[PDB]
């Protein structure tokens, strides 16, 4: 058996010992057995199929990414979402529209904004240096 | 025995020390403010058999007689540190804070725990409470401080999620 | 005189709703200042849009200020009080906008204002 | 003045150092487990560099046009920046970083493009008239590489276009709990950086379909995947500036409690004067 | 406290309005008049009745002003027309 | 005697110019003192970084005061401080280091003194 690893740029989805895996590689379906060859290759969204030694079996999804091959490593830098020149190209488009109408999104952080507030409205005419008779 | 509002004999004893000239102390107190509700508390005291067999020429010889007093104070907004609470507060064996933001939130009684407090301690409690009871307070008055760092965290950490979940279940 | 054995759980449990509905916008008013109305949840959105229409709801005209503003004066039953909070809670009059609860005194005629406006 | 205001006033103080103190606790979680997410980045990086160690400087040599290095008339760089204030100094540090290096290199006549991260730099450079051609924001502590695929898109597009000639990244590095510091580093040309595949001249893949087509994809993976190590590593570095300055905040308020509390004492004992004087010299 | 209770209202002025440059210094918030809008020309009556809510508005909302660029333009307008109001 | 009337615009002008700008600088003493000068906004700054130059330019060295600091003192004709304080105000000496104005007779010696350090 050899060792596979699948990361994604954010995080990692598998690791371990495995028997074969069937990988649908750019230039046509493809299966990996230990020993195999250094190879190179793009694959295509879909499912890959993963059995670990002792025969079990398992599936993963991955979006995209690129297969790599050594004499006993063989890892899949998987991706995140689709990628090909049709969607990259539309979020640019709106990367750039964003840059034009000086847009800005709201972050999500609630507990930051309710604390922020709490301390914006304690801070307030508070006075207290004039009280305090302390230099600065 | 059960003086409502101590506070108020104050003021009447303010009033008819006045109008007798009688030259006054902080706050318009009368001078012997201090002396008046100590004079009264002083009372309230577990007295052993031998003075009850004296006092009663041997009628009775085997009993310790006794009497307990819960006086009532009204504090101005929360302020411990005025002057006449201060005093009692010092003239008494401890005290039971009740805490106006429980009992408008609904915890009824709003019974405070961490500043309120009794001196003679479990001598006073029955074994089964001592037993069952010797957390709570402590666990409580973490719990409230805990449960008050909680609104600016969400994503807490579980080992404190149940901590603010047992809090909780016992309030 | 406010607890139920004396006004009725109708009426306690009314009034404590409409303390807890303003309760929460209270605290809602310093998330909406930071980060706008819309990262609110569903029912967060929901609670606001009721919590201003109560906070509406309360205000009257009085015969007596009728000097004032010119507009005729109300008497509200306790009656058609506690079914006016009720309903506005419960989410019968979701579908009036907040103007039509001003100034209105009875919930009829908050339905009814909603028309012309 | 007068007791009631001043006692009004240290109570306000201590519900500040409260919140302040909380602040200070939810960071320093939020902290590791940003750093946590920091450490889950590097496998893919370091592969996939290893993997271009050897496609292009191998013995074998790619004409590709991110690795040579071309002539500067105009040069990118992508800005990190927090979404979220009360992180100290941090940003403008930052800024006046770039801004030094940046007027460093129009003084030789060159211009310069601003993709910016995080919305604080896009308020700045609004203000400060940088050339902002894109921007993302509103990331908060959930980065994603998919958001980060507009701004670093328009960017390479126009690299290779030739409208750019040298880009960078600017952004916080994280060091200690203690201590980040701010850094301008290169991304295109690719760096030299050893990595030597001399050992690995035992083999050679099998390119499917040719060693190209990949390399493109695998440079601009990698560019995609340093941008994004760059962004997570500055929101651990913004989560613990914000730690140490609730600290600092906290710690101010604690003093300023022992002033207000000097002066409020003052106040209770002039009051009970000037009241018991008023009484007893009124008689008679 | 005697004068306050005998009148009708209060204007009162500030030191602080007065340092700012708000001239005259008049605070809105804590100034009253009994009489109120029954004194006044019903054009006048009509027209300031929206500068009392904008200048209440603009109260409740100043504490975020030295946190504003964290705002939501969705108040920033509020809190900007109150300045100018003022 | 501090009105248009008497001293003419620019210097009345010019005088609430200054007063404007240092209570601008109290009101923001408590926030500094407690989240430090960073939380501030970019503009309030450079309000915080102008009044300090203020204060220190309302400073002058004294004739009768060789006694305690030997500075010799200097003599400031009003002509030559109005347009001092309308320099600073308006940011034109915005370049300069804060003990640069400290001490100093016209807004000449501070341009100089600042060459020294």
Redesign the interface.
């Known amino acids: 058996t050899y060792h596979l690893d699948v990361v994604s740029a954010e995080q990692q989805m598998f690791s371990g010992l495995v028997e074969k895996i069937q990988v649908t590689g750019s230039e046509g379906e493809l299966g990996i057995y230990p020993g195999h060859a250094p190879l190179l290759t793009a694959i295509k969204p879909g499912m890959i199929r993963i059995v670990k030694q002792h025969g079990h079996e398992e599936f993963i999804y991955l979006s995209g990414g690129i297969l790599e091959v050594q004499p006993g490593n063989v890892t899949v830098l998987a991706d995140t979402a689709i990628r090909g020149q049709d969607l990259d190209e539309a979020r640019a488009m709106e990367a750039k529209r964003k840059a034009e109408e000086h847009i800005s999104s709201?972050?999500?952080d609630?507990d930051y904004?309710?604390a922020?507030?709490?301390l914006a409205?304690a801070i307030a005419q508070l006075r207290v240096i004039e009280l305090t008779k302390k230099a600065m | 025995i059960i003086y409502d509002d101590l506070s108020k004999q104050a003021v009447a004893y303010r009033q008819i020390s006045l109008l007798l000239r009688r030259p006054p102390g902080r706050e318009a107190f009368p001078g012997d403010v201090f002396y008046l509700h100590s004079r009264l508390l002083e009372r309230a005291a577990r007295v052993n058999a031998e003075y009850v067999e004296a006092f009663t020429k041997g009628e009775v010889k085997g009993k310790t007689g006794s009497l307990t007093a819960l006086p009532i104070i009204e504090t101005q907004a929360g302020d411990v540190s005025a002057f006449v609470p201060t005093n009692v507060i010092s003239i008494t064996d401890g005290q039971i804070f009740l805490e106006t933001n429980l009992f408008n939130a609904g915890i009824r009684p709003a019974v405070n725990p961490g500043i309120s407090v009794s001196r003679v301690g479990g001598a006073a409690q029955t074994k089964i409470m001592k037993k069952l009871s010797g957390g709570i307070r402590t666990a409580l008055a973490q719990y409230r401080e805990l449960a008050a760092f909680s609104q600016f965290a969400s994503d807490l950490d579980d080992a404190t999620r149940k901590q603010l979940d047992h809090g909780q279940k016992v309030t | 005189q406010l607890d139920p054995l004396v006004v009725g759980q109708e009426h306690y449990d009314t009034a404590r709703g409409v303390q807890s509905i303003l309760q929460r916008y209270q605290?809602l008013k310093?998330?909406?200042?930071?980060?706008?109305?819309?990262?609110l949840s569903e029912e967060d959105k929901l609670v606001v849009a009721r919590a201003r229409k109560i906070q509406r709801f309360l205000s009257q005209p009085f015969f007596v200020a009728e000097?004032?503003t010119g507009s005729p004066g109300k008497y509200v039953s306790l009656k058609d009080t506690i079914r006016g909070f009720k309903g506005i809670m419960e989410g019968e009059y979701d579908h009036l906008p907040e103007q039509a609860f001003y100034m209105v005194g009875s919930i009829e005629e908050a339905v009814e204002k909603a028309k012309k406006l | 003045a007068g007791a009631k205001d001043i006692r009004s006033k240290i109570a306000s103080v201590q519900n500040t150092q409260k919140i302040t103190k909380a602040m200070e606790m939810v960071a320093a979680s939020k902290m590791r487990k940003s750093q946590d997410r920091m450490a889950a980045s590097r496998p893919y990086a370091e592969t996939m560099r290893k993997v271009i160690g050897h496609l292009a400087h191998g013995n074998l040599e790619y004409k590709h046009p991110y690795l040579e290095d071309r002539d500067v008339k105009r040069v990118g760089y992508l800005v990190v920046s927090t979404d979220r204030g009360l992180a100290g100094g941090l940003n403008i540090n930052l800024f006046k970083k770039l801004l030094a290096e940046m007027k460093t290199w129009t003084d030789k006549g060159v211009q310069a493009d601003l993709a910016m991260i995080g919305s604080k730099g896009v308020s700045f450079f609004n203000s400060v008239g940088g050339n902002v051609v894109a921007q993302v924001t509103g990331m908060g502590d959930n980065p994603s590489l998919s958001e980060l695929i507009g701004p670093v898109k328009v960017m390479l597009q126009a690299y290779d276009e030739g409208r750019l000639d040298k880009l960078y990244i600017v952004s916080n590095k994280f060091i200690n709990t203690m201590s980040q510091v701010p850094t301008i580093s290169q991304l295109l040309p690719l760096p030299a950086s050893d990595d030597d595949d001399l050992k690995h001249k035992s083999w050679d893949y099998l390119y499917e379909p040719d060693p190209k087509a990949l390399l493109d994809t695998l440079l601009r993976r990698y560019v995609e995947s340093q941008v994004y190590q760059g962004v997570v590593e500055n929101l651990a570095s913004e989560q613990a500036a914000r730690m140490v300055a609730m600290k600092a905040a906290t710690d101010n308020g604690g003093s300023l409690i022992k002033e207000l509390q000097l002066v409020y004492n003052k106040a209770r004992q002039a009051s009970i004067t000037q009241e018991l004087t008023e009484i007893v010299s009124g008689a008679a």
Do not use: N
């Open positions: 709201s972050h999500g609630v904004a309710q922020s507030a709490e409205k | 605290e310093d998330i909406i200042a930071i980060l706008g109305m819309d990262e000097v004032f």
